[PDB]
């Protein structure tokens, strides 16, 4: 991969990731898009941004985690931008998504734990 | 299935002198701990009281902003009056210690750097301009600095992928370097030469640390299980294991018994050398543990980071939780004690890095 | 000790020998998603060919064709439409995890798989002499397959849960927010990470004095949770 896409998360940890953007997707908190990504950080509403290793230039992105380390939220890099964008339900490529905070939704818990394990990859 | 490989005589004549260098300090360090035993067990135990006393007033005193990156590693000098932190930019930067006013940051790393180690002749026995430290990087970059230049001198190209710590011998002449290949790198200061490539870990190397007398050198990874290696014989002297998650810091006691390991899963392990047991399994943190470090000289108490964003002190031995030095708003990312044992500081990704003293 | 170990091993045994020793292992799937139009199509094609299949075994003759949907006729056709619901209750009846299915599928949901190591939970309690809330704790313990151990003592009594991190999640949100205690407070004391789990099931041990206890901890090899707790409880105590 990329050496600057930094935290990567391994297999067991992208399939939870995946699952909970796909999750996210139904329960319409998921922000898909690096500019919408840029914008729920901006506007503080993400619990964390997942992000593609493989998107080229990757640059185009790792703007992102110096707007994870200005907001205080969490952030993490899946393999391929392809299984992220078939994880938010779009057939196109998605480098860059945006779980965002809703108002007492049931993915709570479960961001919790991704965010408590995806900021243990950052080390 | 140890396999055995031949080295260059670099690392032969290397050996011979660790062990001229090691021994020496082994029976002094040995000798001085049985002077230490044989005085009276009012005085050791009212001197450990009076260090409790003074550990569990451990109050934060000039907690300082590094960078608008989080810091990674923080590195207090010998003579105890520099501070070298590891920011996640380029910038490592040197702050003198216990004013905290910025003194000449050190620019020419490009991804984060891990850790910033001081030479342990820096301010002692090291003139300023010889190199004094010696940074490392999330590419393969192992550097070595001045106190004066604020670019480095002649920088370690063995290296292709993210090298995690950096630490040197006591002698200073070695630097060993965790690599993620797998392994670990000895590199030699006087012939400029890479002497040692021990590959010992089925995944990388995460943090080194080599005895106070010289002879060993610790090390664990991500595979979860940490080695300790002789430098001399090479022969992995006691594999240690009972973590199931990446040891993230490793460090010898300076009495010569204990190396405790703090691992990813939120543990740290005291491990002896006389018993090649595990003593002791501190249930640490809430979350990971990164930086464990030992007091220096005397050697009497045990400070493990975290990644929840406290860094605890244990007694040692003993291991009760003498005080929590939380505060930070961040992960506690690497921390040393000074060596004079009367100051303490972590960075952490809050971008601060503190200073912990008795009242 | 007069020399240490290693020293007495080499005092000779060094030479130009760098070696690579016995490598141990450190102690994958991909679930496939689908964009909504891509489920419409798919959901349509598997229709299609179930249609296609439905009038294929029309087309061979095995059966006549299904039910197409002034009191005699729709008498008639109130009978074949109770046929209707009654196979789309048929349809409901078969499929319908019938007893122990549910109890094998909550099992498989509750049950995770702790190799790859066991999530641990030490809890201290200033008293869980109340017998409803200790039967809470030993009955959500193995509801949620959780293992462990409920030690008792005078002001701090210690709760070591050991299971799968799903499990250990809800059995801090029971401990922590679900359990109404009241002094008496509830602490999370410990949330680590072990190899494998040391405990046999949730089992009430008692005495009375704090030696006897750390034995017994150490009959499991963890004692360090024991005397965790009871440091950190004496030390808010004098605080």
């Known amino acids: ?123 | 299935q140890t396999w055995y490989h031949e080295g260059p005589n670099s690392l032969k004549v290397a050996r011979l002198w660790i062990a001229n260098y090691s021994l020496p300090r082994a029976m002094k360090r040995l000798e001085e701990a049985r002077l230490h035993k044989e005085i009276p067990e009012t005085t050791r135990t009212s001197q450990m009281q009076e260090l409790h006393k003074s550990l569990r007033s451990l109050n934060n005193f000039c907690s300082q902003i590094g960078d608008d990156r989080p810091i990674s590693y923080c590195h207090f000098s010998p003579n105890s009056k520099m501070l070298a932190t590891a920011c996640w930019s380029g910038l490592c930067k040197l702050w003198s210690v216990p004013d905290c006013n910025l003194l000449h940051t050190l620019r020419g790393h490009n991804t984060n750097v891990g850790a910033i180690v001081f030479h342990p002749k820096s301010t002692v026995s090291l003139d300023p301009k010889d190199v004094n430290l010696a940074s490392c990087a999330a590419d393969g970059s192992v550097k070595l600095w001045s106190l004066d230049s604020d670019e480095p001198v002649a920088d370690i190209e063995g290296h292709t992928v993210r090298v995690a710590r950096v630490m040197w011998h006591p002698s200073g002449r070695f630097l060993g370097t965790t690599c993620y290949d797998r392994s670990w790198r000895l590199w030699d200061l006087e012939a400029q030469e890479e002497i040692l490539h021990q590959e010992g870990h089925s995944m990388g190397v995460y943090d080194i640390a080599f005895h106070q007398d010289g002879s060993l050198a610790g090390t664990g990874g991500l595979d979860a299980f940490g080695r300790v290696w002789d430098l001399r014989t090479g022969r992995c002297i006691m594999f240690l294991e009972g973590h199931l998650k990446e040891i993230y810091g490793i460090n010898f006691s300076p009495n010569g018994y204990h190396i405790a390991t703090g691992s990813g899963d939120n543990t740290c392990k005291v491990w002896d050398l006389r018993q090649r047991r595990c003593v002791y399994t501190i249930p640490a943190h809430q979350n990971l543990v990164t930086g464990v470090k030992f007091e220096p000289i005397h050697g009497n108490f045990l400070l493990t980071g975290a990644y929840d964003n406290t860094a605890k002190i244990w007694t040692h031995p003993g291991w009760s939780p003498l005080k929590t030095l939380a505060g930070h708003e961040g992960k506690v990312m690497g921390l040393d004690i000074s060596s004079d044992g009367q100051l303490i500081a972590t960075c952490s990704y809050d971008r601060t890095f503190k200073l912990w003293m008795a009242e | 000790p007069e020399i240490e170990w290693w020293d007495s091993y080499i005092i000779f045994g060094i030479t130009n020998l760098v070696e690579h020793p016995a490598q141990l292992n450190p102690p994958v799937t991909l679930g496939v998603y689908l964009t909504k139009k891509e489920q419409k199509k798919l959901r349509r094609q598997t229709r299609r060919e179930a249609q296609k299949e439905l009038q294929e075994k029309v087309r061979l003759g095995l059966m006549p064709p299904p039910e197409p949907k002034p009191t005699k006729v729709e008498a008639h056709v109130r009978a074949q439409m109770a046929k209707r619901q009654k196979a789309h209750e048929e349809a409901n009846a078969a499929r319908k995890l019938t007893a122990e299915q549910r109890k094998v599928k909550k099992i498989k949901k509750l049950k995770e798989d702790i190799s790859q190591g066991v999530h641990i939970s030490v809890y201290r309690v200033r008293n869980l002499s109340n017998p409803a809330k200790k039967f809470k704790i030993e009955a959500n313990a193995g509801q949620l397959y959780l293992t462990g151990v409920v030690v008792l003592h005078k002001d701090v009594n210690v709760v070591v849960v050991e299971g799968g991190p799903k499990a250990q999640k809800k059995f801090k949100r029971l401990m922590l927010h679900r359990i109404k205690w009241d002094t008496n407070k509830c602490v999370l004391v410990w949330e680590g990470t072990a190899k494998d789990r040391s405990f046999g099931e949730m089992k009430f041990k008692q005495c009375p004095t704090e030696n006897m206890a750390r034995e017994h901890f150490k009959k499991h090899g963890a004692e360090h949770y024991w005397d965790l707790a009871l440091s950190e409880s004496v030390l808010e105590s004098t605080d």
């Not at chain 1, 699952?19 to 964390?48: H, M, P, W």
């Not at chain 1, 992102?64 to 078939?86: H, I, M, T």
């Open chain 1, 1 to 123: 991969v990329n050496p600057k896409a930094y935290p990567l998360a391994d297999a067991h940890l992208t399939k939870k990731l995946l699952d909970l953007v796909q999750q996210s997707c139904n329960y319409k908190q998921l922000r898909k898009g690096a500019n919408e990504a840029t914008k729920t950080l901006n506007r503080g509403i993400s619990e964390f941004i997942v992000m593609a290793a493989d998107a080229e230039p990757l640059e185009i992105i790792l703007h992102l985690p110096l707007l994870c380390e200005d907001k205080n939220v969490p952030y993490v890099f899946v393999r391929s931008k392809q299984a992220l964008g078939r994880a938010c339900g779009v057939s196109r490529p998605v480098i860059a998504c945006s779980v965002t905070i809703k108002e007492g939704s049931q993915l709570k818990q479960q961001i919790q734990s991704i965010q408590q394990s995806i900021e243990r990859l950052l080390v």
